Write a protein that binds this ligand. Structure first.
Ligand SMILES: *[C@@H]1O[C@H](CO)[C@@H](O[C@@H]2O[C@H](CO)[C@@H](O)[C@H](O)[C@H]2NC(C)=O)[C@H](O[C@@H]2O[C@H](CO)[C@@H](O)[C@H](O)[C@H]2NC(C)=O)[C@H]1NC(C)=O
Ligand SMILES: *[C@@H]1O[C@H](CO)[C@@H](O[C@@H]2O[C@H](CO)[C@@H](O[C@@H]3O[C@H](CO)[C@@H](O)[C@H](O)[C@H]3NC(C)=O)[C@H](O)[C@H]2NC(C)=O)[C@H](O)[C@H]1NC(C)=O
Ligand SMILES: *[C@@H]1O[C@H](CO)[C@@H](O)[C@H](O)[C@H]1NC(C)=O
Ligand SMILES: *[C@@H]1O[C@H](CO)[C@@H](O)[C@H](O)[C@H]1NC(C)=O
Ligand SMILES: [Mg+2]
Length: 490
């Protein structure tokens, strides 16, 4: 597997077959797949260098791991996009040996430059990925180059983790499965050769090529993108609160949730679907919250300041099953988003919520990730306005803003899912650059589909479903009052 961890360094070498048996359109699919793998690899904030080599009769090195630009995601993707298939027009045979020997030469050059005996050289783990149809037909057996690489890298039983070779035929093309299998590593309990229809399928397989099991620091907003992973692996910030409500881990000891929920907190755990129970040291409930604040004047429930923090009695161990989500307006989120150093909270709100309709998610009672569209600007006004049909909860509503204040994000239109009562307090979040950011938390709505089964409202069912989520960008003074020494705010 390709290991994602803090200690050491990862060199990834991407070998793209530009031989005649691969059409220009196939090659574009190779470039698309390579770009995704680069984007994903850079999402973990680990120490990684990427080489890019295209090959047919002879290899062409577009990016070397000796070059400092190989550690810069933008330079890497650019060398990739600047890769032309026609640069191999006069040698269109398939010399897989020579492509692999190009990697060998690079390894030789690097070892020389760093020193065989140094930890700078010995700490590097090497992952080679060939995108090819596996139809080598010149240059001799690739095994010679494989064996040279195993030798220079001193791959023994103790150093088996220092080398992985993958051969992947992605696209509609005709592939020789036997050569792919022969090229790939042979490791017990793992596969190193794949035949995949498209980049979409590659994205799924790549998640299973990565071993993130030893990434146990507090890195935020990291999850699993595989449809085959567990719910908790997909959303490891997710917690259940038994006072039922949901919440989000925002550090290794603090949980963000809704005030209206108010004990045990159930946190992800790699050892069972059942999670791990935590007790609470301290709860901090917003003093503004009073659900009956407006009751005497005909707004029977009011959710202004619906926010709470829980400090757990012990620290959570970070794992594939338990991690903080990223909060906007922090330095950690700024880095995840790859934005300028001096960015402000306003900049993060612009970064994340720029469109009039922003695809977002919340987590269901059963752990499933569900979809919503947050409506911004003019569409926020139309989204929120339908509360004026809710005459039973709001018999005395003179202005929409008496119940749907600027503290709330809005969703629930068209084909959106709508949170259930027990989903309250859970994160409303978005994915950007393969990282997850909490922009709000589930507070209230006009329709409870659960009042694994959710009912849709009838199209006639006045008022229609509509959902209102405390907006984290509107709660900064309170969050900062309480978490100033927990998180690193911009
Ligand atoms: C219906 O809702 C409106 C809007 O909030 C209330 O009227 C508001 O009352 C505030 C002070 O409470 C006042 O400063 C606003 O000018 C006024 N807004 C509007 C648009 O009129 C109603 O509150 C009731 O109505 C009177 C007349 O305004 C208030 O003076 C009074 O305090 C209040 N009645 C009581 C004793 O509850 C509200 N209607 C009801 C029946 O609650
Ligand atoms: C998305 O979640 C997947 C499902 O959990 C992850 O795939 C799992 O990765 C694990 C770590 O590499 C594998 O763990 C085991 O490691 C031991 C010892 O190091 C091996 O001996 C075992 O063979 C292996 N598990 C066993 C007992 O077979 C899991 O095998 C593996 N599961 C599957 C279905 O592939 C993905 O890594 C994860 N991806 C991301 C990006 O988070
Ligand atoms: C292919 O060979 C021709 C003739 O020598 C040459 O003019 C052309 O530039 C070559 N193409 C590439 C990509 O080098
Ligand atoms: C979880 O709930 C979703 C949403 O209704 C549903 O599609 C899915 O089938 C459920 N998962 C399980 C385990 O049944
Ligand atoms: Mg070929």
């Amino acid at each position: 597997k390709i290991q994602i961890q803090r200690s050491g360094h990862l060199n990834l070498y991407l070998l793209l077959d530009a031989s005649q048996s691969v059409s220009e359109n196939d090659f574009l699919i190779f470039k698309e797949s390579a770009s995704l793998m680069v984007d994903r690899i850079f999402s973990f904030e680990i120490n990684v260098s990427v080489a890019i080599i295209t090959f047919a009769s002879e290899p062409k090195v577009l990016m070397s791991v000796l070059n400092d630009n190989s550690r810069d995601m933008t330079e890497v993707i650019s060398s990739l996009e600047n890769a032309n298939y026609k640069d191999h027009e006069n040698g269109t045979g398939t010399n897989t040996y020579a492509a692999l020997n190009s990697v060998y030469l690079m390894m030789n050059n690097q070892m020389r430059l760093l020193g065989m005996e140094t930890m700078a050289w010995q700490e590097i783990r090497h992952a080679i990925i060939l995108l090819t149809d596996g139809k080598s037909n010149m240059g001799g057996s690739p095994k010679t180059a494989v064996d040279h690489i195993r030798e220079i890298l001193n791959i023994n039983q103790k150093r088996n983790d220092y080398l992985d070779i993958y051969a992947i035929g992605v696209g509609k093309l005709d592939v020789d499965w036997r050569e792919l299998n022969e090229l790939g590593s042979k490791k017990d309990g793992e596969r190193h050769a794949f035949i995949l229809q498209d980049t979409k399928a590659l994205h799924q397989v790549f998640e299973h090529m990565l071993d993130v099991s030893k990434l146990t620091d507090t890195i935020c907003g990291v999850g699993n993108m595989s449809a085959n992973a567990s719910d908790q692996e997909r959303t490891p910030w997710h917690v259940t609160i038994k006072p039922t409500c949901r919440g989000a881990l925002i550090s290794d000891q603090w949980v963000l949730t809704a005030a209206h929920c108010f004990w045990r907190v159930n946190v992800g755990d790699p050892k069972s679907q059942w999670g791990k129970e935590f007790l609470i040291e301290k709860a901090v409930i917003s003093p503004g919250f009073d659900v009956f604040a407006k009751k005497n004047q005909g707004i029977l429930e009011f959710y202004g300041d619906d926010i709470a923090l829980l400090k757990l009695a012990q620290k959570v161990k970070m794992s594939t099953h338990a991690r903080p989500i990223c909060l906007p307006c922090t330095m950690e989120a700024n880095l995840a988003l790859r934005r300028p150093q001096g960015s402000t909270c306003r900049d993060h709100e612009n970064e994340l919520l720029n469109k009039q309709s922003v695809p977002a998610h919340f987590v269901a009672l059963n752990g499933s990730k569900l979809n919503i569209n947050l409506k911004m600007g003019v569409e926020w006004t139309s989204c929120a306005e339908v509360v004026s049909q809710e005459k039973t909860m709001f018999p005395n509503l003179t202005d929409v803003r008496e119940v749907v204040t600027d503290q709330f994000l809005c969703s629930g239109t068209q084909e959106d899912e709508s949170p259930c009562k027990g989903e309250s307090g859970g994160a409303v979040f978005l994915e950007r650059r393969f990282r997850f950011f909490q922009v709000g938390l589930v507070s209230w709505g006009l329709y409870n589909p659960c009042l694994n089964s959710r009912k849709r409202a009838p199209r006639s069912k006045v008022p229609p479903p509509r959902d209102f989520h405390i907006n984290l960008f509107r709660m900064q003074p309170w969050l900062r009052q309480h978490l100033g020494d927990v998180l690193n705010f911009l």
